[PDB]
Nucleic acid binder design. Structure first.
Ligand SMILES: Nc1ncnc2c1ncn2[C@@H]1O[C@H](COP(=O)(O)OP(=O)(O)NP(=O)(O)O)[C@@H](O)[C@H]1O
Ligand SMILES: Nc1ncnc2c1ncn2[C@@H]1O[C@H](COP(=O)(O)OP(=O)(O)NP(=O)(O)O)[C@@H](O)[C@H]1O
Lengths: 560, 559
DNA sequence: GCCCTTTTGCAA
DNA sequence: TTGCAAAAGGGC
């Protein structure tokens, strides 16, 4: 209820205003202290500012020689707190430096910095109450305010809550050394969003096989286990090429009713049912590559729909698929001229090949251009998982349904990169096509993003630049700010930063966002696991230190 | 049990907290001193911190003129000690700077640094005892605490112990200039791990041919000799292309029963027995060098399994292998059309070649297989890539623990491709096995600057993603500046010997902040076997150790 | 990493 | 017989 110290000086140091505070022997003897990085209230001219404690140093006050006095007391062996109160009362001062960050105005908005420097005689500094801190953070907890690991510097009641307005339609970056909590942070945010706001969809690109089932003691549990614990049914769609191994695994950990929580789907299709899909994939593979699809590929890409009415034209497409190595289902009848062959049988295949046009004959001749499709082909599938995912995420059925689509990238081997690029392109094109009718309203979860946001001409770069218009959020983790382009870093809205050991990383971070210049020293020298610095635009344009929650504790606590 | 001096000031300097200590005439007369780099205890507000002595200088205390006083005493032949005790009490002061490293939490983890700056009247500084130091380092000795070469800074009873939790799933950097003990440190750590925790596997990429046998006086013995000394049997798998020479050396230097300790396997295979492996290697080469595989290679890669059931396609595959220069075993027969040939004979080889599609294009582009000559040997019939994969990640090999050593020089110029292929295969298998068994093995590589850069980033991926699967890295480079910051910023354990260059210490400090406190010691103290160690997050501060010789470790352990 | 150079088929 | 395409290796 009273000022902590006395303000004795103030100035403008660069783009910020700073002031000097002095703590007296009485206040120090009452146990009053100020922690570095602590948030305080500054009253000046009838206006309230938020301030941060930056520095602290000892300096003599008045006419005194603290060194001589203390050395003499030590030499003569006098207990300074019991024999010489007046000697103890002339050296027990302490100095602090406080920077003004801005002030809260009108409807919770933040006015940054200031043009008015406060005179010393009329400036006061106050300890901030939990109600004030709660208002500061607010205008399903994910973390709570903390200062380092000091006792008394923890505020379990001051929390930052998850809210779809914070994440959907906006870009979030998750940085930190390996082993410090990026994946746990992501999973806690996603579980809270799924539990509290069930109309938000997620597209998780799982490259390490950890976001569905995770039983080893090296990470937090998976989303399937979290959803089973919280009683969330029928919201996970898992795509994989190991649909039998994963089905076996799910039954040991989710029990006999695992199908109520997870739906396993294959990443394989029958290309004798989707020749247009085969041709489109072969055509797009080269655009995603350097450049210049061939003329015989553009011709097919544009005219295969026309060809479908001509059995002679379609016979050459099926022959190209069969010659590239794709296995047909037993009893597949191909009609040529005035005869029907069974390509599944070697004798009929040879007969038709010997017995065998708008550009389809060139496609048949250059059949080895389809061999890569054999990484996706499986006879008897007839699914088109690309379209299946498209209506999972952007289907008109939703208008708010909630769909967590998890892609098991490793199972695809060396086709995963091409598959990811193609799927992202399709989803973004559909989202653009639906503009003005419905919003996408889903979040792309992207780990090790430095492999996706490198080239400016990439679909992921384009999504990061233009997803806010169409309602697509992005949440990307990289372990190192220096791995991300500065153009993306500067345009990112939300930041969640754990410990970074390198000076270059913190320099890049503060070069991207100025307010991050006040925590670089803490980041460099405090390796604490699960301790985050969070920054949100435009309502919390300043860094706040949060202690993040374990997913196990969150699950055990949300049952109440 | 009493404070050393008096604290006269404190402040925040950069990311750390410092305080100033003054030593008085009585304490200086009693002989009490503080060594630079010594660890002390700081008591403040009922809490104990660990501090390090960083600086020391002489400064006048009070209103005095030490220069004039001392000069006058020297001029007037005045012996201060015996004649003027009062003039000697006003000049005999000394100053020290102490940095607060952090706070030890009993029943908990060390808390680094501090946000609370101590007032100068409430801080005390104490000397740390042997029990306190032992407790600090505890949270099979590998080294013992030592401060320089000064007498009284030697603590043989305060030791740092090898623990699998410090090394498995983590990265350890070993730096130092030539001849200062990096290889000895590596061998001591590996021998202690093998002896005490036999459930950890190792993959050593021996680029210098020193980790199996070492009989010269220019380095310490090898792992085979250490294991023979300690009685460890049936744990070393040695792969080489010089099997006969290495068997002769092993017999000569380990006796007749050397086969109970080392099992020697070749790095050669018969490609007429593994045509699918030949095609896979040819296909993976392009990706490993950053390019995109051609259509005729993707066709074979995806379709050779089907082709194996068609003798007409298999004839072209074998013809391509024979055209590339791969020697078949004596008496091999082909079955082109409904006829049989003997490609091992130069007559029927030409007969088939003149008597002669996906396989036809492979036969026409046969020169794509010539590099396989580096690994081909007729009549071998054992896939060494699969054998190594089973050794490191087997269903039953889990537990026992296996030490695989790769004799890289014997492969000549194919070693780079072999190493990249093996690492990619092992990482893919480890990722696929996530949830059923943990990899739990340590990749050991010397001259790491030659490995930690390549197209497709295989070693970058291993370093940045191996923690989840329990894949540890132990890489020695001899110069920090030669390691990318992308990999330096993900390292947890550091072991640094003397570095002469200024840029080396600057890079090390930029990579890990606390190493700013020992850079000046490193720059000016060339001591062999003196290592500064740092372990996150159990010991997040630099501790100076004297490391043991493997020769002495073996004698100590034999009992 | 990117810009020549070659064998091979389809045409007219 | 030559122009034109298309895939692939080699030189820079
Ligand atoms: N908030 C937290 N509180 C306590 N322990 C935590 C917290 N977050 C993470 N951990 C611990 O850190 C371990 C690894 O967490 P993890 O989420 O995998 O970090 P990470 O940043 O993803 N490492 P990586 O993905 O390899 O770069 C967990 O198994 C926990 O033991
Ligand atoms: N801890 C130690 N105590 C005493 N002598 C040691 C110690 N470590 C190394 N030496 C001596 O130094 C020599 C060289 O050791 P070594 O381990 O090969 O250093 P190095 O770092 O590997 N030099 P290099 O690998 O050639 O760049 C040994 O043969 C010993 O004579």
């Amino acid at each position: 209820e009273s000022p902590i110290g006395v303000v004795v000086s103030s100035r403008r140091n660069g783009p910020w205003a700073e002031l000097t505070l002095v703590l007296t022997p009485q206040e120090l003897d009452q146990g009053k202290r100020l922690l570095l990085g602590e948030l305080v209230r500054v009253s000046s001219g009838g206006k309230d500012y938020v301030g941060m404690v930056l520095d602290g140093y000892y300096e003599p006050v008045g006419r005194s020689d603290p060194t001589y006095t203390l050395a003499l007391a030590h030499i003569n062996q006098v207990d300074l707190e019991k024999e010489d109160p007046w000697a103890r009362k002339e050296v027990n001062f302490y100095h602090h430096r406080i920077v003004l960050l801005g002030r809260v105005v009108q409807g919770g908005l933040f006015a940054p910095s200031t043009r008015l420097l406060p005179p010393v005689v009329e400036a006061r500094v106050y300890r901030m109450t939990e109600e004030e801190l709660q208002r500061l953070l607010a205008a399903y907890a994910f973390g709570h305010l903390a200062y380092g690991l000091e006792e008394g510097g923890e505020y379990p009641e001051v929390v930052k809550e998850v809210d779809p307005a914070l994440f959907v339609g906006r870009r979030t970056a998750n940085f930190g050394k390996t082993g410090f909590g990026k994946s746990n942070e992501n999973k806690v945010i996603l579980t809270l969003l799924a539990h509290a706001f069930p109309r938000v969809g997620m597209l998780i690109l799982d490259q390490n096989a950890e976001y569905l089932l995770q039983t080893e003691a090296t990470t937090s549990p998976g989303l399937a286990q979290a959803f089973k614990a919280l009683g969330i049914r029928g919201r996970i769609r898992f795509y994989t090429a190991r649909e039998e191994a994963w089905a076996r695994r799910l039954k040991e950990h989710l029990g006999t009713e695992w199908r109520e929580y997870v739906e396993v789907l294959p990443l394989k299709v029958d290309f004798y049912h989707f020749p247009e899909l085969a041709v489109a994939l072969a055509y797009q593979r080269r655009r995603l590559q350097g450049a210049e699809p061939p003329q015989y590929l553009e011709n097919a890409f544009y005219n295969l729909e026309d060809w479908k009415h001509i059995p002679d034209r379609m016979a050459y497409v099926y022959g190209a698929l069969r010659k590239a190595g794709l296995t047909p289902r037993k009893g597949l009848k191909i009609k040529y001229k005035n005869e029907n062959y069974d390509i599944s049988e070697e004798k009929s295949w040879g007969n038709l090949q010997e017995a065998m046009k708008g550009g389809a004959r060139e496609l048949y001749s250059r059949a080895k251009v389809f061999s890569f499709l054999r990484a996706f082909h499986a006879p008897g599938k007839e699914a088109n998982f690309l379209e299946t995912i498209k209506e999972d995420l952007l289907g008109e059925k939703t208008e708010g349904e909630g769909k967590v689509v998890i892609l098991d990238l490793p199972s695809l081997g060396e086709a995963a990169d091409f598959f990811t690029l193609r799927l992202m392109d399709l989803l973004f094109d559909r989202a653009v096509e639906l503009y003005g009718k419905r919003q996408a309203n889903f979040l792309v979860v992207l780990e090790e993003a430095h492999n996706f946001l490198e080239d400016k001409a990439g679909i992921f770069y384009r999504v990061a630049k233009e997803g806010r218009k169409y309602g697509i959020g992005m949440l990307y983790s990289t372990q190192s700010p220096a791995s991300i382009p500065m153009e993306i870093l500067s345009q990112t809205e939300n930041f969640l930063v754990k410990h970074l050991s390198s000076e270059e990383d913190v320099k890049v971070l503060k070069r991207a966002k100025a307010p991050f210049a006040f925590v670089a020293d803490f980041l460099l020298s405090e390796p604490i696991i699960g301790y985050s610095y969070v920054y949100f635009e435009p309502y919390q344009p300043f860094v706040v230190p949060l202690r993040v929650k374990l997913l196990e504790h969150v699950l055990k606590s949300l049952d109440s």
